């Protein structure tokens, strides 16, 4: 039967970038060329593979990662990028083999009074390793004295609200992203494009 890409792209609600959702896709047939060509995608860049070539290749598994960021941060969802998102929320390896798809979602994820349900990890002591998901809410020590739960001036809650308003500039508007990872192990392949 077919692979369920709709459940990712057409999902009504998306996850925050620090708590990005991953859908493991296996044991199915996938339809790509008709799926991608829609141009209802503001950002569409692939690394290590051609989007027209996927209808020929088979992979052991395919991962569809999904989250929401703001416009000025779409440039960070890429291999070898640095910044608040790529270092503290979602990081791709330097040899990332897959595609990054993004479309403006201002009509879905921004509210007149502002939507603060989309958060991101602002402070973290060390960078995330590739494909790491940190959902920890432990108070961040940013001074000398430890925090031990107590929040304050050298003790910050590591997550921060986005605040999407429909009237904000495109840089401050919400964008939904889908990252398709194509994994090739020395195992029998289960996902082939057709």
């Amino acid at each position: 039967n077919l692979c369920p890409f709709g459940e990712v792209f057409n999902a009504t609600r998306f996850a925050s970038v620090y708590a990005w959702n991953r859908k493991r896709i296996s044991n199915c047939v996938a339809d790509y060329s008709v799926l991608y060509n829609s141009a209802s995608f503001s950002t569409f860049k692939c690394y290590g593979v051609s989007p027209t070539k996927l209808n020929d290749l088979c992979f052991t598994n395919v991962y569809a990662d999904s989250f929401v960021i703001r416009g000025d941060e779409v440039r960070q969802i890429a291999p070898g990028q640095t910044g608040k998102i790529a270092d503290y929320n979602y990081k791709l390896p330097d040899d990332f083999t897959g595609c990054v798809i993004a479309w403006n979602s201002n009509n879905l994820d921004s509210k007149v009074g502002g939507n603060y349900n989309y958060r991101y990890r602002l402070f973290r002591k060390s960078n995330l390793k590739p494909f790491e998901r940190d959902i920890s809410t432990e108070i961040y020590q940013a001074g000398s004295k430890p925090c031990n739960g107590v929040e304050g001036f050298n003790c910050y809650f590591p997550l921060q609200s986005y605040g999407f308003q429909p009237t904000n500039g495109v840089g401050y508007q919400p964008y939904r992203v889908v990252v398709l990872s194509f994994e090739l192990l020395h195992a029998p392949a289960t996902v082939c494009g057709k």
Partner: antibody
Amino acid sequence: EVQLVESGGGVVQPGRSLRLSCAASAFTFSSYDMHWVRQAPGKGLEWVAVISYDGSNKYYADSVKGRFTISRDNSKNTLYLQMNSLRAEDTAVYYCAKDGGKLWVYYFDYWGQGTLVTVSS
Amino acid sequence: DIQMTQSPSSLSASVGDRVTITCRASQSISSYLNWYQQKPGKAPKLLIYAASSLQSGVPSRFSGSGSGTDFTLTISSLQPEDFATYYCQQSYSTLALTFGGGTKVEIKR
């Protein structure tokens, strides 16, 4: 022995439209992806767009996205590039390139001789 | 985008010399680095693809090497028809293909 012949270049005023062609020969044209690459006067090379073997998939560089359109006619073995809303920054020699196809990624193994597009009023 | 920096911008050498051109990437592009030759007024022609693979019909005096961020094109014995501009281009970002600035090989007088 792979041949690529361009045509349709010339002068054009800003905001107008111009269409280029690229007649291929001596290879299975309906099986390879195709590219367009331009080169401004005295500058380097810039990849413009790519179209799949069957013409169902199109991908464009950001500098021409929503402004240029790539297409192909496999029965005629010709590649097209509809250039609308031409700015002065588009003044360049336009090449068409066949995809090598030996890799998972794109690369150009044969190029056309190129045709000039001069955008000025 | 991935910037490709070539070094040197211009070099002068004679026939039979050993020429080496350097190509650096702003980030890792694995082995997806391709070399091209362009004569003045002529179309580019593919020399090396996938950093080290020689295109059919290209003389064996051309060779390419490297991985990650540093790449090198090498002409063992320079020939009179080899004086041209040489570009490197990365294909790691397949939908954002970028070229280097180019290295023009000139005649040392």
